[PDB]
């Protein structure tokens, strides 16, 4: 006899596991045991994952309710997991998504010269090179502080916050609930301090004294600030760090890239489809029966969408596994979710790629692994897969 089959699979980031395709094909709707202990159900073929992230009724909100099936402990309070829900209700939505845009002006130029400057550094210091921890987090961590509105050399303590944050526990973490009161007491006092201006954090700043909000609470606006740090810095640095192994192992592609820089939007569009960076399927909660495939889905029961099994899907993608620059349907990948709760950072993460793969094209053509690929050490019971360090040389 064997247990119910366990999620998630692997922790590994450069290769899909073959029990995705089995899935899709035999039962792209069928029950698993999380972390926790808890039964869901994981959803893996195009179809069925658009359907569950397209119904409201599936609902990312109530995954936070009181004895609930978990697929992880939180680390963040209750109503945070309602965060954009809550920046919608308090009317600054827009406000949020016009502070997050990559076409601020002299914003790539910024990132640019930071993900030079960093190369640059590097270079001088002599191959062997850590790109995750030298490179992509870094510049992400860069760019947030600069989206932000707040001083640069206050990111690493944010930063550092991150490895615990974005964990993926059986169990309440107390180090989450230390470094997230810091990190909003810090938030907060961005808020009065009259040095802030420019950025979300001075638009919030400015918005908090502004009568047309004075319903909202600090407590929200602080919690922006360290919602949208910690989600955009771990999702960009984690994304642009897997994207370099694929492009890494793909040298035909790095080399068309670098002598084609024009095709690097196609490239990073496919590098996102075919990212594993989501280490697991994204939880919703039923809150009706509905039926998905051949399951009726029963009203309190969890449901998770395994991203890479919509992306890898033969049946919307022909040829899942290859990147191919000429797709008929090339955004239509679910890397960013779909339906009410599609990320509002697609378009900052999309350049903060495009901006680092080219940086590093023009300045390490030869990049290249420099140890064996099965020697990368893989993140474990984190919400997303990476690499601890991704050294390389050129
Ligand atoms: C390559 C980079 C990124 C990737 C792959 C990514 C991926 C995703 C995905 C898949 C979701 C949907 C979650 C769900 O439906 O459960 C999401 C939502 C979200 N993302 Fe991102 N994201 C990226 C960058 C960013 C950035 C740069 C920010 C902010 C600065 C950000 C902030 C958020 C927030 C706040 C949500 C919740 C939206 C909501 O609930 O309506 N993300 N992201
Ligand atoms: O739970 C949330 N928490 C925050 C994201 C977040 C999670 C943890 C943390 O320490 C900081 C931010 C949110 O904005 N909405 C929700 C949903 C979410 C989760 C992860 C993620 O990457 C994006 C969205
Ligand atoms: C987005 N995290």
């Known amino acids: 006899a064997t247990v119910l089959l366990e999620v998630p699979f692997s922790a590994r980031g450069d290769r899909i596991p073959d029990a995705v395709a089995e899935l899709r094909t035999r039962?792209?709707?069928?029950?698993?045991?999380?972390?926790?202990?808890?039964?869901?159900?994981?959803?893996?073929?195009?179809?069925?994952?658009?359907?569950?992230?397209?119904?409201?009724?599936?609902?990312?909100?109530?995954?936070?309710?009181?004895?609930?099936?978990?697929?992880?402990?939180?680390?963040?309070?209750?109503?945070?997991?309602?965060?954009?829900?809550?920046?919608?209700?308090?009317?600054?939505?827009?406000?949020?998504?016009?502070?997050?845009?990559?076409?601020?002006?002299?914003?790539?130029?910024?990132?640019?010269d930071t993900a030079n400057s960093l190369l640059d550094n590097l270079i001088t210091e002599g191959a062997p090179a850590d790109l995750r921890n030298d490179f992509a987090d870094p510049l992400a961590t860069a760019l947030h502080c600069k989206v932000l509105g707040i001083p640069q050399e206050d990111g690493p303590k944010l930063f550092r916050s991150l490895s615990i944050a974005f964990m993926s526990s059986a169990d309440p973490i107390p180090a989450a609930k230390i470094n997230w009161d810091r990190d909003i007491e810090y938030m907060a006092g961005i808020l009065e301090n009259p040095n802030i201006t420019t950025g979300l954090m001075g638009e919030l700043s400015r918005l908090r004294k502004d009568p047309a909000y004075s319903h909202v609470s600090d407590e929200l606006f602080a919690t922006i600030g360290v919602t949208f740090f910690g989600a955009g810095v771990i999702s960009t640095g984690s994304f642009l760090t897997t994207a370099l192994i694929s492009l890494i192992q793909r040298p035909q592609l790095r080399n068309l890239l670098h002598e084609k820089p024009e095709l690097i939007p196609a490239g990073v569009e496919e590098l996102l489809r075919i990212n594993l960076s989501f280490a697991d399927g994204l939880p919703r909660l039923a809150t009706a029966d509905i039926q998905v495939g051949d399951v009726l889905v029963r009203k309190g029961e969890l449901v998770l969408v395994l991203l890479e099994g919509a992306n890898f899907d033969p049946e919307h993608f022909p040829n899942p596994g290859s990147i191919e620059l000429d797709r008929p349907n090339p955004t239509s990948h679910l890397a960013f979710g779909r339906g009410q709760h599609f990320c509002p950072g697609s378009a900052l993460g999309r350049r903060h790629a495009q901006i680092g793969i080219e940086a590093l094209l023009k300045?390490?053509?030869?990049?290249?692994?420099?140890?064996?690929?099965?020697?990368?050490?893989?993140?474990?019971?984190?919400?997303?897969?990476?690499?601890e360090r991704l050294p390389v040389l050129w």
């Open 27 to 112: 039962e792209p709707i069928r029950k698993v045991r999380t972390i926790t202990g808890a039964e869901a159900w994981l959803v893996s073929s195009y179809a069925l994952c658009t359907q569950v992230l397209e119904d409201r009724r599936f609902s990312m909100k109530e995954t936070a309710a009181a004895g609930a099936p978990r697929l992880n402990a939180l680390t963040v309070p209750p109503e945070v997991v309602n965060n954009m829900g809550n920046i919608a209700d308090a009317g600054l939505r827009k406000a949020v998504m016009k502070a997050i845009t990559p076409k601020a002006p002299g914003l790539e130029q910024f990132l640019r």
């Open 363 to 387: 300045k390490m053509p030869g990049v290249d692994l420099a140890v064996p690929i099965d020697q990368l050490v893989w993140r474990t019971r984190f919400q997303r897969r990476i690499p």
